Design a protein around this nucleic acid. Structure first.
Ligand SMILES: [Zn+2]
Ligand SMILES: [Zn+2]
Lengths: 125, 127
DNA sequence: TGCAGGCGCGCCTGCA
DNA sequence: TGCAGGCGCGCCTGCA
DNA sequence: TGCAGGCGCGCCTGCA
DNA sequence: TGCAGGCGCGCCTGCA
């Protein structure tokens, strides 16, 4: 537990280039999900109640499989798993989908599920 | 132009190892400044009003010159200039004190000024 | 309708 | 094949 | 000589 | 007092 003065000084802290890019990625995601009824609400539910099961929160898959946000490319499930669960996540080799996920990245479907609680972290083989 | 829902989703964002280390460094700083009358108030004033002049906000200098925060060592003025002004700051070679600073790191005194607005960013010289 | 500017997927290339 | 990075057309948006 | 990194004793604090 | 845990400066070492 920190002091109110500590919280105030941390409000003046400058975010690094990576933190600023993550904000852009969350913003790019919301723009897509706002077009789908209940998607925003489902993602918020998954981030708020980790122990509770949640539905798939998907986005369209590109031919390459990579997603671009502000001049940077990456795998969509890796990008959002890094934002909300594991900032030190190395690659998709460190992820495996849970059995409930109907649209995991590896399934190569039209839609890709980006619900970070539909993936588990594994040791890279 | 941030939407309320974006503000909420960003509240659930995990800070990286570097962001978490910075919180420890700010906490380690406050513990030292709380012992000095008006030091906390002066630092808050310098971060809130960047165009306004402010006094020195100093901490004791070690023999080495380096400060340790949670198993990691660095120069104190570099640490706090990175927190509040330039996250991409490479070394002390990229900093020069202002003329108003009475306690710059380079002057080698018993106290070192860590007010980030008492330093200016310069290009590091070619070796 | 003329004139701009911002974004990203698709396309291409280059190591290993 | 896996993995990455550079480039630009097409699409979208906003004025007067 | 500049620049790092690893180790532990001394110091401080918090329950009972 | 007894007992424990967290933190960092000082000390040491190793390059180029
Ligand atoms: Zn899913
Ligand atoms: Zn100063």
């Amino acid at each position: 537990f920190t002091s109110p003065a500590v919280k105030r000084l941390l409000g003046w802290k400058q975010g690094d280039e990576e933190e600023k890019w993550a904000e852009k990625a969350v913003d790019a995601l919301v723009k897509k999900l706002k077009k789908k009824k209940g998607a925003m609400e489902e993602l918020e539910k998954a981030l708020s109640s980790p122990g509770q099961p949640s539905k798939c929160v998907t986005i369209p898959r590109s031919l390459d499989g990579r997603l671009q946000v502000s001049h940077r490319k990456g795998l969509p499930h890796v990008i959002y798993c890094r934002v909300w669960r594991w900032p030190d996540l190395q690659s998709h080799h460190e992820l495996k989908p849970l059995d409930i996920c109907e649209f995991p990245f590896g399934s190569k479907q039209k839609e890709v599920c980006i619900n970070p609680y539909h993936y588990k972290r594994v040791e890279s083989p």
